[PDB]
Amino acid sequence: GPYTFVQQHLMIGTDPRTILKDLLPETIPPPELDDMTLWQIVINILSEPPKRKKRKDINTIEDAVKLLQECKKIIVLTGAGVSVSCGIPDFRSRDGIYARLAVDFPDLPDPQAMFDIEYFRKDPRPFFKFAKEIYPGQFQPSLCHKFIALSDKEGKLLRNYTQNIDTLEQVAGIQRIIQCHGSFATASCLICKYKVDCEAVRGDIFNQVVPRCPRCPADEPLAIMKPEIVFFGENLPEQFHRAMKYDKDEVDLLIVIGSSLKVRPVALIPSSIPHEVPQILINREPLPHLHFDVELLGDCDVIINELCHRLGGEYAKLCCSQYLFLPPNRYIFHGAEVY
Amino acid sequence: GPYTFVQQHLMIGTDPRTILKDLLPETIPPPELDDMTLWQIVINILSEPPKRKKRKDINTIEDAVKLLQECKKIIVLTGAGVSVSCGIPDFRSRDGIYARLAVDFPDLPDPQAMFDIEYFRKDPRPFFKFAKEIYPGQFQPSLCHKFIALSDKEGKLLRNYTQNIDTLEQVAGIQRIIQCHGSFATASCLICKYKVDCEAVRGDIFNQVVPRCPRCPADEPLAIMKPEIVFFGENLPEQFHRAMKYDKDEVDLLIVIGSSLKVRPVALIPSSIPHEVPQILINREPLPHLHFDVELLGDCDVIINELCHRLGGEYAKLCCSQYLFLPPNRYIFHGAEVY
Ligand SMILES: O=C(Nc1cccc(-c2cnco2)c1)N1c2nc(-c3cccc(C(F)(F)F)c3)ccc2N2CC[C@H]1C2
Ligand SMILES: O=C(Nc1cccc(-c2cnco2)c1)N1c2nc(-c3cccc(C(F)(F)F)c3)ccc2N2CC[C@H]1C2
Ligand SMILES: [Zn+2]
Ligand SMILES: [Zn+2]
């Protein structure tokens, strides 16, 4: 669109600067800039998609808390950060759970292969030994899970969108949730798609027995009950999109906790809601590509404790401090790791 | 990489401007710019991939001709432009050849469907009626085809890469070629992959007979001989990549004719060769996103005639004029359509 606009102008010999004098007033582009380069800049300015800019009137951790109090339709996005204190065995790294699996199951190429649906059909047994070391109840939720849970009890949580699959969200008692990469909440047969509760296949998996489908014939191979993890290639749950279409025009506050927001669909949620709605980051590291009103950087448990401290009331009854303030709105706490 | 660099700096409260005073000397960013915005700019400058900038010493159509003379390892990229004079029925538009096909074959959803391999299996007959209206010999090559052909006779053509499938390249006698979206040059069975010449299935297709595979049993459905067009989904010919790996470090001149360079793999060829190697555009419209040393805009036949005029010698014996000069290097001829 803008591209054609510039093509038109090139056809007649327009001096880009007269266009740039309009698009960048109070800015004079250096003399030694190539004239085609100038045009490319023109296209860029016109092509740049509207990205939310930071609210100048929301800056301090005190402002954060007010929001937390006065808001009532809150969207919370959570990543690996929320579950760092939970002692969960890592599984993405070649050195992790894949280590203890490669010894009993030497047919595993990648730690990714156990999350591929194709290899799952060949051998589901390695995944299910993993599914045992992770299954809900085996791990205590973090202060953060507890924090989200209470705000949903208070009717304030509009939705918790998560990248996690540890399903500690349900363990911790959070009702209004959406697990984007799936979870252990339910299990569905690969074949007749018979859906069952989480508790249905608990015993089977705890006995290292591959859960079988009760509807399908017993003489059926792939009549296996698979926890509804989004395995490679598989589509994002339909519940996600339907939820966003509603939530985006309803939320009055977005909080990010523990995520470095670089993997879809969760990474695109900040950029997709009304720019006016306030936005708070809580995270080990800063996220330059986005404009957050308040940045609380450091260990996510730490910062959630510091906010429950300040929120008082029922929130303070969850707690078990020092920061560096970089203006206008950045706070560095203990666990700021930036790697 | 640059992203982490900026994360580090945010952790300690660096003023972006002291970084920008270094990255943009002789440029002072407006006062009212958000400090996170400034950082985003920092990331952009550091993240920007090296793109060839225009040679200041190559500008005029006379310079173009010198190149054409003194060069001997020339890469020529061609698009729809080269074949506009050739009277070929269009086939991409819903209103085109798909018009005369939808009446005899009402099972066609798209004009794209006849280029899908999946629908081709269901019914190949519509494609083959198209393949008849297009088949080599039925159309006379343009002045441009002839131009490329002669330069390859003279040993100057390193390679002609094309987006076209009209195969007028072989009709016109160009040996050193690469047809990126495939061509009618050869045909291969969907099953045993028996390869045959173009002339092998000429008779069959001219009689509206679906060419059959001589190796496969006669009682075989998909033993059909398919012209090696890249149909939807299919991979780019292996001949392409192997050719580029050689050609990129060998070419001394790149010429673009008739293409608006926006569809891969052909669109990425200018950006992928040594920046020092000169680059000439010949095209209905200008291509802002790229930096061409000389821009000859207008009908491609016109401009090729004007160059054969000037090249003299064997080139002038092909010919059957007015321009507007926009400095430093843009020429507008007759067919400049910019749509
Ligand atoms: O896009 C810009 N510059 C730019 C400058 C100002 C604003 C924007 C912009 C992009 N989206 C909204 O605004 C973009 N580019 C750019 N800008 C410059 C540039 C350098 C110094 C000063 C200036 C400026 F903007 F004129 F002051 C631009 C140089 C090369 C480039 N490259 C060619 C096009 C790209 C990459
Ligand atoms: O990328 C730029 N600007 C920019 C400016 C100068 C050079 C480059 C650039 C990009 N690649 C090589 O150089 C890019 N952006 C940009 N630039 C500006 C801008 C406006 C006026 C002046 C200037 C400048 F560059 F400081 F003079 C930048 C404003 C907003 C933005 N947006 C936030 C980041 C994007 C989009
Ligand atoms: Zn079943
Ligand atoms: Zn065959």
Numbering used by the authors:
A (entry chain A), B (entry chain A): 183 to 502, 640 to 658
Give the authors' words.
X-ray crystallographic analysis of mini-hSIRT1 resulted in the first detailed structural determination of a fully functional human SIRT1 with a bound small molecule activator. The N-terminal SBD forms an independently folded, three-helix bundle with 1 binding to the helix-turn-helix (H2-T-H3) motif within the SBD, consistent with the HDX-MS and enzyme kinetic results. STAC 1 interacts extensively with the hydrophobic side chains of Leu206, Thr209 (methyl), Pro211, Pro212, Leu215, Thr219 (methyl), Ile223 and Ile227 from the H2-T-H3 motif with only one hydrophilic interaction: a hydrogen bond with Asn226. The major mini-hSIRT1/1-binding site is a shallow hydrophobic surface depression with an off-center, deeper hydrophobic pocket, that the CF3 group of 1 occupies. This is consistent with the observed structure-activity relationships developed across multiple STAC chemotypes, indicating the requirement of overall flatness of the core scaffold maintained by an intramolecular hydrogen bond. In the crystal structure, Ile223 lies directly beneath the STAC and lines the pocket into which the meta-CF3 of 1 inserts. Asn226 appears to form a hydrogen bond between its carboxamide nitrogen and the carbonyl oxygen of 1 on the surface of the protein. Interestingly, a STAC-mediated dimer of mini-hSIRT1 related by crystallographic symmetry was observed in the crystal lattices. Comparison of the three structures shows that the locations of the N-terminal SBD domain relative to the catalytic core are divergent among the three structures, likely to be impacted by different crystal packings.
Sirtuins generally catalyze the deacylation of modified lysine residues in protein substrates coupled with the breakdown of NAD+ into nicotinamide (NAM) and 2'-O-acyl-ADP-ribose. To address this, we developed an engineered hSIRT1 (mini-hSIRT1) that is biochemically equivalent to the full-length enzyme with respect to basal catalytic activity and activation by STACs. Mini-hSIRT1 comprises a catalytic domain that assumes a Rossmann-fold large lobe and a zinc-binding small lobe common to all sirtuins, an N-terminal three-helical bundle encompassing the SBD and a C-terminal β-hairpin CTR peptide18.
